[PDB]
Write a protein that binds this ligand. Structure first.
Ligand code: HEM
Ligand code: HEM
Ligand SMILES: Cc1cc(N)nc(C[C@@H]2CNC[C@@H]2NCCNCCc2cccc(F)c2)c1
Ligand SMILES: Cc1cc(N)nc(C[C@@H]2CNC[C@@H]2NCCNCCc2cccc(F)c2)c1
Ligand SMILES: C[C@H](O)[C@H](O)[C@H]1CNc2nc(N)[nH]c(=O)c2N1
Ligand SMILES: C[C@H](O)[C@H](O)[C@H]1CNc2nc(N)[nH]c(=O)c2N1
Ligand SMILES: [Zn+2]
Lengths: 407, 410
């Protein structure tokens, strides 16, 4: 019931006790491991509220104090009478920071306590949502010196009045299918790009068209808004050694800002809660650029490198992969836009893991997601055993809202 | 139940029904996933069920479930167990058993090859000397002058657990490791402990960087004995780079035959504690893990130094660049010498084809994503994007602890 975790490179062994505080289900059983699967009332709410407030009061070291008991009473009163309750500002900030702390798939958690929370619970309209999001985008970007932030819109009520950002990220590039049969721009966003057209967006029809926001307030039909172009920081991609690299026409945006997840704090559900940090280079250079279902540029780059593409065993894909990612990193760095490489990020995560074991009794971690999609075993996370379990407050994936909406 | 797996690159969805025949436990619970944890004498009572289950599978695979041959064999085995407390596999059953243990091995990307396995029955073996001879023959047969052939040699099964046959080497061919008084290691640091045991047992160590270890062989629960594999049987490949002429001067070589010798083979509830098996390498096992792990030969710095890369910051990706060059060299060197090897693109692509076939014809293919994804260039291989379900089928290969921890010295 107490579990050990071993690092096979350093022999360091850590004991996990935090896992006994998990409640939610993994999807695994005693017979089947689903570790690699991407998606594995009033009576219900008060145990959730209590559990959260207990840990909150424990963290500020007022557990079992009069203020603790008073608050548990106050929330109990409010649930019984309204069927929900409102978080205090202090509880909101704590909850959001801990949802990040608990995100087992996030390599960047050393930073968890440095998170700027924007309380947008007073928002009532899509226009209001747009304003809050522009202010988030500008604060977080900080002229290239990126700062982690979350903006939190009003909580679910009866679930017929949900706030949602329809984009999966605040900033993404459009995707268009061509009479050609191919795809122009980002193939990931073809479906969403069509929905934007169907609501009236005028697409430049380019390879890198920043999508408009589709914001839904109060369960209403979503509305289109364009982010001011001067708020969207982008980086043209060049290579420090290869002159020709620039002419591939590549760029990426500086701000990764996930907007499709659901924040749960103390049993309350925040269905629109865009958050942002800064990129690890591989996210762009390995995944966005080289996934076959994405911009898929390996073939074009290898050709410009004059590599022999006749057989897989020349590792031409692998050589091109490295150079692409060198370029991504160099370009961000030259432009003073925060980026972290996979060596540095994973090293910091090991240090974070050791702090969390020492000071909290464990750290939930999803090895499948923590190990970078290139050079896995030359990063220290590869050799690190990790236990994966679900703690609250949490971020959860939620389905693309267009499937689950009436007009 | 029907469980779905999706490939996020192709949107191909597959349905697993085979997991319903899984008995053994994963280490995982509804509350905790131990998917990245490396390590997550019977009774008559349990033995006949295990036998029956195995023989039922065997007979149904040969399209004879329920036949008189089937019913008679069940009866024969039952009686043998009741009377002798164990039983002996027929040759046909051993072969089937060993092939399926490989077929069931979740962590093996090489499984498209499962049905082509040469089984050597070494159940008549009685002494360490006999074990040595069997192993030499395996090495020579499997090596096949560089045209590698998969094989397994199966020594007598466990009886009371007091008379186990064991190969003390973790692989038949490995390089010695020598911890120096200044804290440095010469040769393979993974093998320091075993090297020290060999030396204690009387091995005279060459004390170089690539000394092939002697075999330490335990027969019938006796103290193990040392044997040197004839050097002309140990095929090796000096590593060079197609473009970089200085690469040879690093003095690297590797052996051609990967031959795992420390695992336990379970068939029909019988335990084969000595069952060395072998195939051929995927390049990354050598170029990524053996050469570039910090706890192993650790050559990244020296290679990047010779490539004159910018080494002052990790963000230049000097480690990644040198990693790719080292792995090009390994594949190039094996190919040039006509020693079978497979690159990680070809290997993973074949594995996806294998896996899809296995779903169609078997109802599933248990696979451990943590191990199946190669340790470089993960997401540019098709397996990265492939959802997998990990569960335990028997016959199986199991890790067992190193015998020097458990062995009682006579
Ligand atoms: C500060 C720098 C940050 C870095 C370097 C970072 C890095 C990463 C990486 C590399 C992943 C893997 C996901 C992928 O590859 O798509 C990830 C996932 C995730 N991150 Fe972090 N992150 C950062 C900030 C944050 C912040 C501020 C939050 C919350 C406030 C957060 C929460 C999450 C969550 C919930 C996931 C899983 C996302 C999903 O399931 O799609 N991250 N992060
Ligand atoms: C024929 C070519 C083969 C290739 C290319 C191949 C490839 C691999 C690779 C890359 C691994 C991961 C283990 C590691 O990286 O250390 C592995 C593991 C494994 N393989 Fe295969 N393999 C082959 C043949 C075989 C054969 C013949 C058997 C048994 C008859 C086998 C059974 C296993 C088992 C039991 C594991 C897990 C090992 C452990 O837990 O340490 N493989 N294989
Ligand atoms: C199906 C599904 C489930 C799930 N949980 N998720 C997804 C989005 C996928 C995951 N992986 C690629 C893509 N998500 C792409 C961007 N994710 C960046 C995470 C991040 C990084 C740095 C800073 C941040 F604030 C946030 C899909
Ligand atoms: C702790 C622990 C548990 C476990 N199950 N296992 C280990 C051996 C580790 C796995 N990973 C590195 C090292 N084993 C290296 C040898 N693996 C060869 C697999 C192979 C390849 C080609 C053909 C074959 F026949 C067999 C350690
Ligand atoms: C099927 C598999 O789980 C899937 O491809 C995962 C693997 N690891 C990942 N890791 C990260 N960081 N992000 C991802 O999107 C994925 N995808
Ligand atoms: C901690 C982690 O499970 C461990 O390092 C695993 C990861 N994946 C692996 N994959 C393979 N093929 N071989 C290994 O030795 C390992 N090691
Ligand atoms: Zn699991």
């Amino acid at each position: 019931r107490f579990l050990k975790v071993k690092n096979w490179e350093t022999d360091v062994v850590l004991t996990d006790t935090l896992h006994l505080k998990s409640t939610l289900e993994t999807g695994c059983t005693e017979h089947i491991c689903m570790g690699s699967i991407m998606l594995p009332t009033k009576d219900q709410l008060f145990p959730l509220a209590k559990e959260f407030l207990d840990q909150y009061y424990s963290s500020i070291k007022r557990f079992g104090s009069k203020a603790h008991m008073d608050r548990l009473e106050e929330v109990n009163k409010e649930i019984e009478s309204t069927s929900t309750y409102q978080l205090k500002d202090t509880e909101l900030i704590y909850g959001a920071k801990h949802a990040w702390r608990n995100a087992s798939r996030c390599v960047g958690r050393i930073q968890w306590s440095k998170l700027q929370v924007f309380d947008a619970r007073d928002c009532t309209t899509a226009h209001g949502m747009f304003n809050y999001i522009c202010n988030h985008v500008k604060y977080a970007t900080n002229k290239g010196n990126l700062r982690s932030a979350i903006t939190i819109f009003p909580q679910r009520t009866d679930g017929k009045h949900d706030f949602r950002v329809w984009n999966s990220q605040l900033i993404r590039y459009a995707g268009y299918k061509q009479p050609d049969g191919s795809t122009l721009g980002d193939p990931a966003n073809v479906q969403f790009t069509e929905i934007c057209i169907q609501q009236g967006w005028k697409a430049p029809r380019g390879r890198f068209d920043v999508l408009p926001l589709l914001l839904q307030a109060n369960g209403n039909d979503p509305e289109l808004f364009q982010i001011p172009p001067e708020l969207v920081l982008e980086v043209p991609i060049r290579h420090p050694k290869f002159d020709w690299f620039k002419d591939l026409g590549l760029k990426w945006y500086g701000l990764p800002a996930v907007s499709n997840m659901l924040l749960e704090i103390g049993g309350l559900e925040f269905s629109a809660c865009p958050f942002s940090g800064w990129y690890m280079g591989t996210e762009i250079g390995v995944r966005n650029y080289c996934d076959n279902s994405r911009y898929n540029i390996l073939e074009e780059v290898a050709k410009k490198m004059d590599l022999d593409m006749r057989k897989t065993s020349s590792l031409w894909k692998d050589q091109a992969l490295v150079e692409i990612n060198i370029a991504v990193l160099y370009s961000f760095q030259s432009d003073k836009v925060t980026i972290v490489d996979h060596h540095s990020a994973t090293e910091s995560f090991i240090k974070h893991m050791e702090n969390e074991y020492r000071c909290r009794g464990g750290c939930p971690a999803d090895w499948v997601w923590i190990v970078p999609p290139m050079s896995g075993s030359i990063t220290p996370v590869f050799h690190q055993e990790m236990l994966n379990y679900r703690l609250t407050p949490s971020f959860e994936y939620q389905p693309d809202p267009w499937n689950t909406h009436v007009w």
